[PDB]
Amino acid sequence: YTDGSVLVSHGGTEMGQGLHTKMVQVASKALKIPISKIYISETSTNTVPNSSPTAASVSTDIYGQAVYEACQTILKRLEPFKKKNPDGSWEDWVMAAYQDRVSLSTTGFYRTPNLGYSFETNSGNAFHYFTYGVACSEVEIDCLTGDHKNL
Amino acid sequence: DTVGRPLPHLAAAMQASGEAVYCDDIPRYENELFLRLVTSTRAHAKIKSIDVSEAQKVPGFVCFLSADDIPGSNETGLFNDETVFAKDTVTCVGHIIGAVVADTPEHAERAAHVVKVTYEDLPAIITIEDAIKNNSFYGSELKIEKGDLKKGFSEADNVVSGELYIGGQDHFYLETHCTIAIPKGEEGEMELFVSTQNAMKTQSFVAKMLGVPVNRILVRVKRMGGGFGGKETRSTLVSVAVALAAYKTGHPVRCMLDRNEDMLITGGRHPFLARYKVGFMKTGTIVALEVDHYSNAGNSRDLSHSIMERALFHMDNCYKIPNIRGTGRLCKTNLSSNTAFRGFGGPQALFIAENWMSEVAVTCGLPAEEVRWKNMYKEGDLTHFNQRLEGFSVPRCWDECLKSSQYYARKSEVDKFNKENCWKKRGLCIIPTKFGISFTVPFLNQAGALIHVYTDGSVLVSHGGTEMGQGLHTKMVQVASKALKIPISKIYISETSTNTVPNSSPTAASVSTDIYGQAVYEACQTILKRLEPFKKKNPDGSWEDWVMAAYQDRVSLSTTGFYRTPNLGYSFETNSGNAFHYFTYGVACSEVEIDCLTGDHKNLRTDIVMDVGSSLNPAIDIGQVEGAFVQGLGLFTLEELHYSPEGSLHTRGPSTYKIPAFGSIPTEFRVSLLRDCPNKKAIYASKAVGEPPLFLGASVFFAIKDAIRAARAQHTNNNTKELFRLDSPATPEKIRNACVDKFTTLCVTGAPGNC
Amino acid sequence: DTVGRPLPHLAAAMQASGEAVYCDDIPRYENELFLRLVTSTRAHAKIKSID
Amino acid sequence: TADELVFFVNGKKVVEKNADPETTLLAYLRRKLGLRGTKLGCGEGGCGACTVMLSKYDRLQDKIIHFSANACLAPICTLHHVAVTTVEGIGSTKTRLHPVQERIAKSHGSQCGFCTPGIVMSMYTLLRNQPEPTVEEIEDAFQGNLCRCTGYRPILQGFRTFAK
Amino acid sequence: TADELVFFVNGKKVVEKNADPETTLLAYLRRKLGLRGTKLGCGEGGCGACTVMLSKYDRLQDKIIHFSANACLAPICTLHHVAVTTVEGIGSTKTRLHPVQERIAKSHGSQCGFCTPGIVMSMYTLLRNQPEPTVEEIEDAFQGNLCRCTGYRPILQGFRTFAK
Amino acid sequence: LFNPEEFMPLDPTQEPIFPPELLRLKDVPPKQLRFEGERVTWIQASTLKELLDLKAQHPEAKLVVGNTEIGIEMKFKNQLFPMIICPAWIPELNAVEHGPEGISFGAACALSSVEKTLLEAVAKLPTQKTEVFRGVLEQLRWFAGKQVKSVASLGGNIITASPISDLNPVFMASGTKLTIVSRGTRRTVPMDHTFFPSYRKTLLGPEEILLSIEIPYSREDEFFSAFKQASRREDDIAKVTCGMRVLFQPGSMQVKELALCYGGMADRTISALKTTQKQLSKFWNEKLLQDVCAGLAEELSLSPDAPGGMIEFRRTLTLSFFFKFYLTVLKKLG
Numbered sequence A: 001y002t003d004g005s006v007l008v009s010h011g012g013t014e015m016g017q018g019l020h021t022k023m024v025q026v027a028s029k030a031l032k033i034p035i036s037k038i039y040i041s042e043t044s045t046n047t048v049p050n051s052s053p054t055a056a057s058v059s060t061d062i063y064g065q066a067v068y069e070a071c072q073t074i075l076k077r078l079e080p081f082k083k084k085n086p087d088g089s090w091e092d093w094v095m096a097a098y099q100d101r102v103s104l105s106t107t108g109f110y111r112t113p114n115l116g117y118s119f120e121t122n123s124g125n126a127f128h129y130f131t132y133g134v135a136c137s138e139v140e141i142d143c144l145t146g147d148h149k150n151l
Numbered sequence B: 001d002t003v004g005r006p007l008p009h010l011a012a013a014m015q016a017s018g019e020a021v022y023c024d025d026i027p028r029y030e031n032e033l034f035l036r037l038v039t040s041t042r043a044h045a046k047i048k049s050i051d052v053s054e055a056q057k058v059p060g061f062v063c064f065l066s067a068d069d070i071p072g073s074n075e076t077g078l079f080n081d082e083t084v085f086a087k088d089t090v091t092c093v094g095h096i097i098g099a100v101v102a103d104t105p106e107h108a109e110r111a112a113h114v115v116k117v118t119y120e121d122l123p124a125i126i127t128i129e130d131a132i133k134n135n136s137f138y139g140s141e142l143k144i145e146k147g148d149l150k151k152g153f154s155e156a157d158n159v160v161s162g163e164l165y166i167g168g169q170d171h172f173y174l175e176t177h178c179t180i181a182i183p184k185g186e187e188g189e190m191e192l193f194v195s196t197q198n199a200m201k202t203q204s205f206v207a208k209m210l211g212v213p214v215n216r217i218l219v220r221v222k223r224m225g226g227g228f229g230g231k232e233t234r235s236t237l238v239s240v241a242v243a244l245a246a247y248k249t250g251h252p253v254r255c256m257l258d259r260n261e262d263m264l265i266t267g268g269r270h271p272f273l274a275r276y277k278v279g280f281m282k283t284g285t286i287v288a289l290e291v292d293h294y295s296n297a298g299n300s301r302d303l304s305h306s307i308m309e310r311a312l313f314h315m316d317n318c319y320k321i322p323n324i325r326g327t328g329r330l331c332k333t334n335l336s337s338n339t340a341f342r343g344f345g346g347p348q349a350l351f352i353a354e355n356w357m358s359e360v361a362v363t364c365g366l367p368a369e370e371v372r373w374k375n376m377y378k379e380g381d382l383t384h385f386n387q388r389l390e391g392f393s394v395p396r397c398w399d400e401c402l403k404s405s406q407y408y409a410r411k412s413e414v415d416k417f418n419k420e421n422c423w424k425k426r427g428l429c430i431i432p433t434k435f436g437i438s439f440t441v442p443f444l445n446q447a448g449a450l451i452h453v454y455t456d457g458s459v460l461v462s463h464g465g466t467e468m469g470q471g472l473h474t475k476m477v478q479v480a481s482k483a484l485k486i487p488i489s490k491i492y493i494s495e496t497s498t499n500t501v502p503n504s505s506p507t508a509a510s511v512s513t514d515i516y517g518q519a520v521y522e523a524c525q526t527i528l529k530r531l532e533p534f535k536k537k538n539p540d541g542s543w544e545d546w547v548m549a550a551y552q553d554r555v556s557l558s559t560t561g562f563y564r565t566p567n568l569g570y571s572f573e574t575n576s577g578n579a580f581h582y583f584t585y586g587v588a589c590s591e592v593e594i595d596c597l598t599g600d601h602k603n604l605r606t607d608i609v610m611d612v613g614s615s616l617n618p619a620i621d622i623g624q625v626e627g628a629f630v631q632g633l634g635l636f637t638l639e640e641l642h643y644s645p646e647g648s649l650h651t652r653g654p655s656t657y658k659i660p661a662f663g664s665i666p667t668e669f670r671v672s673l674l675r676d677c678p679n680k681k682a683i684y685a686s687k688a689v690g691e692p693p694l695f696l697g698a699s700v701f702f703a704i705k706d707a708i709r710a711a712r713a714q715h716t717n718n719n720t721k722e723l724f725r726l727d728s729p730a731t732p733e734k735i736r737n738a739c740v741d742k743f744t745t746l747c748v749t750g751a752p753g754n755c
Numbered sequence C: 001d002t003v004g005r006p007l008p009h010l011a012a013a014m015q016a017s018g019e020a021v022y023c024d025d026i027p028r029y030e031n032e033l034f035l036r037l038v039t040s041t042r043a044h045a046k047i048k049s050i051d
Numbered sequence D, E: 001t002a003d004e005l006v007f008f009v010n011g012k013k014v015v016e017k018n019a020d021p022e023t024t025l026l027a028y029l030r031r032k033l034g035l036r037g038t039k040l041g042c043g044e045g046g047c048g049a050c051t052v053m054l055s056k057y058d059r060l061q062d063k064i065i066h067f068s069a070n071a072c073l074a075p076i077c078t079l080h081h082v083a084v085t086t087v088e089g090i091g092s093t094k095t096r097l098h099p100v101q102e103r104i105a106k107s108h109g110s111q112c113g114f115c116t117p118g119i120v121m122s123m124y125t126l127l128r129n130q131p132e133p134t135v136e137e138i139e140d141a142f143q144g145n146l147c148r149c150t151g152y153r154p155i156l157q158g159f160r161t162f163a164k
Numbered sequence F: 001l002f003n004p005e006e007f008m009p010l011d012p013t014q015e016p017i018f019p020p021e022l023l024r025l026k027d028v029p030p031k032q033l034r035f036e037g038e039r040v041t042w043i044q045a046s047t048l049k050e051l052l053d054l055k056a057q058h059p060e061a062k063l064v065v066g067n068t069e070i071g072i073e074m075k076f077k078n079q080l081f082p083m084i085i086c087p088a089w090i091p092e093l094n095a096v097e098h099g100p101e102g103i104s105f106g107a108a109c110a111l112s113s114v115e116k117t118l119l120e121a122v123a124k125l126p127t128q129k130t131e132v133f134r135g136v137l138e139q140l141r142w143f144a145g146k147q148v149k150s151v152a153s154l155g156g157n158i159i160t161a162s163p164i165s166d167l168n169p170v171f172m173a174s175g176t177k178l179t180i181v182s183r184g185t186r187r188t189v190p191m192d193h194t195f196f197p198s199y200r201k202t203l204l205g206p207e208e209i210l211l212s213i214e215i216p217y218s219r220e221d222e223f224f225s226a227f228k229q230a231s232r233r234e235d236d237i238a239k240v241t242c243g244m245r246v247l248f249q250p251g252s253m254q255v256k257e258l259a260l261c262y263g264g265m266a267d268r269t270i271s272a273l274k275t276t277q278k279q280l281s282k283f284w285n286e287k288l289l290q291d292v293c294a295g296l297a298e299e300l301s302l303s304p305d306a307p308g309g310m311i312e313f314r315r316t317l318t319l320s321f322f323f324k325f326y327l328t329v330l331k332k333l334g
């Protein structure tokens, strides 16, 4: 918007996992502006259509990419104004862009490459990569009651 | 492909059934409160106290809000020269001091009336002459000048100088100003439902008052029950107040203005005073023109500068004038700030032009059509601001209107009528117009759209424009359908919102179809390019097939579109650069009968020919011509605002302010759109239609003046070349008074008189 | 640039204060109604009547 | 010790046990009954945006009568045993439009749409009194209805089809 | 024929003139008073999402007592002359957070946030009885609060700072 | 632009039914009703007797029929009337009675009923008997809309006593008879200059109510016109409107009676008494035209600062309207 504040919308929903937090961190990094200038309000079908469910643990990966791309478009469009006013502020560059009738709205989109596993041929990538981990747990059982303590 | 077909307004059936939802029709939240503005009763005064003691005793009273309650900024208005809430000094009757909040609109009303304000009066400036006398202006003189005036006036055979006034106008949108504000309680978030043509400024202004980033504020506009410019900026008077109430209470709050509040507070069309001098030949040819314009701007700048700019751009009307100088000054007065109204300074300057042109024809003793024609621009001429007239269609409109209206035969019938009638007279006049298309501020000439295609193949279009009855959404659906090659039944537009298309210009300047049409078209082109590979693979498949395949191939079915009108940028320093993209043209012939004894009149017949290029929708465009013409008929002949000498508006409702009624329209009322005139410069060869036809209403005014001339020939004197001043609006008062006879002079009593 | 830093969840302060709005926390319209599902008490049956 | 106020709106009985004398029919329809087709345009009788039809059995004429009225000035307390018909009472897009509604929409007689319900009810009321009106009766039916958008021509043209 | 029910919520007097015996404090807070910080998680006393603090003067003990309760099971009709404190009664981002609120937020003890008000009210109550509790007392305060997101570690870690 | 051949035909029998439940309730005998609000008690009177008693008991109680004036007063002029009586149900206040001298209308009769009745009278009766009726109809021509006329009462307009009432000048000029009642009292008076003593006031007692209004048949040698200004710029002042009557000695053009009454020339409806008195026994000619115009110019002269402005226009109308009457009477005299 013309005050330099940024509204980000993406196909992902917040359920406690901190997806919007991460998307704001990404946008802040990509645009090179403080997180306080960016806001995510909600997820809605009239801003981003045809969204996949927020699922498969990939929301950061895929919406992170879409947000990044949209940010890159914004930066490209602002670049001439940065050059004209190199000692100026984000707010001054945005206002100059607006007054020069440069669009400050853009979509971003990402499509995970090289996926296509076939049950017929047992080939083609099913996953983009894997997440790994190891855990070691110790317990004490009460053999008389079936209760236990996680130590 | 419905482009060029007379498709009814998409919402017309719902509007007829009362199902169409306007702002106040939105259901109320269980805890929703109501706001009523508290407003100055003095033109200019210091505020000495505000007593809410009696208001607090009204059942359901919640709070009184004033400048002290604002968390962010009390500085607002387009040029930051207004208060949200007046603090120490009021500067017009209707100036907003504060607001009451209550549990019902009846209780808010009751409480507001009982709020008591104490004032100390200050010297006030009400009239343009007050303002000139006191040097009370906003900014410095505006000017356009071409040629050599001293030379032109030296070559002139005749010179006529004079003064003319044109009264203002109340928008009288059937739906008054309305806002609902819903505070979310999180992070300063607020969602507003507003009857506004300017969601962007609403959003910004609410944000500034609250002191929160613009991204926290969402403004949504489904539709307006009329706008006419009166909701281009002045809607923020209500919106910002209601947002404050929401912020303060934490409850949803709404306000819809009563008619009397709306007429007082929200501003109207600028009254203009003109002082003019024209030099001309005995043939009627104009060789020199000087016009000083003064607008009554009221108590803030608002859009007054750009309105005066448009006035200066239109002081030529359709006439080539080699030596010309127009100036404009904005009068700073203790009246509600005047604003945009359909035409935006154009009708005023065009009326001033036609007035001196009427006097040229009278002075020369030549038929008015002939003087107009002889002075008309030709294809490819430059205007006084040095813009080339390309596709100048006025000559075609003129010829066709002369023929279809049967002007010459009817002129002879009017003369026969005036010969046979002593106390009634007819008049007939034919008038051209041109109207420049684009915001005169270059950066407002930008437009965005956002289109989504859902997986069932249905399409949701969003664009920066708002619907106020002009059929903009209708035209955008027709455009999108043609562009995508799918039926209109597959496309929907729901509303205008700041979170779908940001930084939108106000829906104004008649350019919305033009600029949102291009933005929508471009978005549609992007969708088509992305679907092309799927059509290639399945050329006999359906739209739905193509869309689903694209979805399943992970091709995005959502895109923005954007348009920026090219080659715009007039300089007042070089008197060069295009102020406009193109011009819309039209001609109207009107006939009237006046009652010389009473000042009443009948509109007998009107014929209009309008150049709208290749119309996207003839039914909608004919509707715009008719509605705009009737508003102009109101401006010039019916509608009159009246103030006490202390500057308080007397005319605050339909009982004292008379907009045209069913019975007001010309008995025979014909409109034609010019044929085979595509416009290369706009979407699918169409032209802007919103504002250009309104000045054609003046054809009635100049027919009335023709009829008065005949009455004066009958009863007043023998001077066939007499110039008398007739100000606008030509109400029964002005008409009657101008028919000088044995009654106006009291000669009938036996006294001598000027009869 | 906060990427890689332990920034608290953006809404956490409002979640702790009870200001974060979840679906049922949205205010009710004056005319707003309430729905309750009627569900089978049998694993597999013909529906014979509903009274 | 207040009597109940009993009237009808669109064929349905309304029993108001706590009528405030100050309550206008327009306020009641919009803000109590939630029928928002009827609009506020001025609150002083000039504009017709709030036009409804009233029907009662006139005990002095021994006759059912139907007339138009401005909802904005009609006190509900005058309406005991009166029937109110609003725009939603005569047709809708969810059921079937009344011929009056169809013709004003199709004739391009609705632009912004705000005056349309009031005009529809003025025309409706005429047809309920006179099923075969003349062209003149039709024009006179609208002296109390203002439209700022259309210039009136299309509304009259579409309604002229009811004449003879 | 029916008595008035008088209690206090966040310092403000509530006078219920027509108390229904079936009405729960949770329903009253949310749907009559519009204080939606207190949540429904189960309606059976097991999750503590609806946790509030109640205060009263004990006549027998001769002092003001403070304890936690499940609003989902507290009939409002038990609350005559009792003071209720909810999450909105102790701090706000619009004014100032209570230390309990600040610490759970900054310690990463809130993910979805739905259990957070109840846990805040459990910890707040403890602190109102014991300004300097032990690590043991802190964990015990939460036997009645469930969280599905966090795995509890950060919540205990953040509140440990209040000991001993 | 559209195709009417495709429109749904109208089916007059398929209209919403008049609520049968409501129809059943019409048998129930009317009785007084009482409504109580935050600020106002409203009594719906079922009988004239009830009305007169209520008014005797509460003389300050405000009558409301159509509310087209009281609604404006309450909403816009801040007025509050703590007790209202609505007499609309009372048969006597709704009666339309044909008598020897004229047509009587109960005071609650809506202007639409008056217009219907008079239009019927004018179609049936000799032109010479319906001069005043046609005056009334001319004033009702472009007067509000159908909505207002269907509920605005005849008595409401009269007692409102606006300086710009279009009806009061006609009723004054014709000496229309007003039957006025309270508990005990009953009196009939022709309306004349004295009926309106001051701004918005009438010559009624605090308890009195206007029962009926009798609009006279015109007589032989009697002629009537009414005219009105076609602009209004202020709430209730400075809109010229008039009723004009002349009675001639039998078969002559010699003035026996003359009445010129004007609204919009003062803070009440007024009669140009001094001017008209001077024309008694004079003949209907140019000299009378000149003398009346001179009389009107003087008697009705407006100060430069008169409320409502339009000073020259209004003077001119008073004269121009008389001129139109003068010529119309000449045409009627043959």
Ligand SMILES: Cc1cc2nc3c(=O)[nH]c(=O)nc-3n(C[C@H](O)[C@H](O)[C@H](O)COP(=O)(O)OP(=O)(O)OC[C@H]3O[C@@H](n4cnc5c(N)ncnc54)[C@H](O)[C@@H]3O)c2cc1C
Pocket: B655, D044, D045, D046, F062, F063, F064, F065, F066, F067, F068, F069, F070, F071, F107, F108, F142, F143, F144, F145, F148, F151, F152, F153, F154, F155, F156, F157, F158, F159, F160, F164, F165, F166, F167, F208, F209, F210, F211
């Ligand atoms: C939009 C509109 C346009 C109008 N145009 C015109 C116009 O062009 N010319 C014109 O002359 N008028 C005009 N009027 C005024 C209209 O004619 C009057 O307002 C109407 O006749 C008043 O009648 P009512 O029944 O509505 O009165 P109410 O508002 O109910 O009462 C009016 C007054 O009369 C008193 N009253 C009523 N009945 C009696 C009774 N029988 N006995 C004693 N007192 C009584 C009441 O106490 C009150 O003081 C217009 C009004 C509207 C709203």
Ligand SMILES: Nc1nc2c(c(=O)[nH]1)N[C@H]1C(S)=C(S)[C@@H](COP(=O)(O)O)O[C@H]1N2
Pocket: B226, B227, B228, B229, B341, B342, B343, B468, B469, B470, B472, B507, B508, B509, B510, B511, B512, B513, B624, B627, B689, B690, B691, D111, D112, D149
């Ligand atoms: N029905 C209707 N038509 C209308 C208006 C309106 O408010 N209602 N506003 C006019 C004005 S002032 C303008 S500038 C244009 C704006 O819309 P456009 O750019 O889509 O023509 O519509 C014109 N026609």
Ligand code: MOS
Pocket: A054, A055, A056, A057
């Ligand atoms: O993919 Mo998570 O919603 S199971």
Ligand code: MOS
Pocket: B197, B227, B228, B229, B230, B232, B340, B341, B342, B343, B344, B507, B508, B509, B510
């Ligand atoms: O540009 Mo129209 O809103 S005056």
Ligand code: FES
Pocket: D039, D040, D041, D042, D043, D044, D045, D046, D047, D048, D049, D050, D051, D070, D071, D072, D073
């Ligand atoms: S709202 Fe305008 S007449 Fe009722």
Ligand code: FES
Pocket: B174, B225, B226, B469, D109, D110, D111, D112, D113, D114, D115, D116, D146, D147, D148, D149, D150
């Ligand atoms: S359609 Fe807009 S007022 Fe009539």
Ligand code: FES
Pocket: E039, E040, E041, E042, E043, E044, E045, E046, E047, E048, E049, E050, E051, E070, E071, E072, E073
């Ligand atoms: S809702 Fe789970 S304990 Fe109350």
Ligand code: FES
Pocket: A016, E109, E110, E111, E112, E113, E114, E115, E116, E146, E147, E148, E149, E150
């Ligand atoms: S943060 Fe989600 S249940 Fe606790």
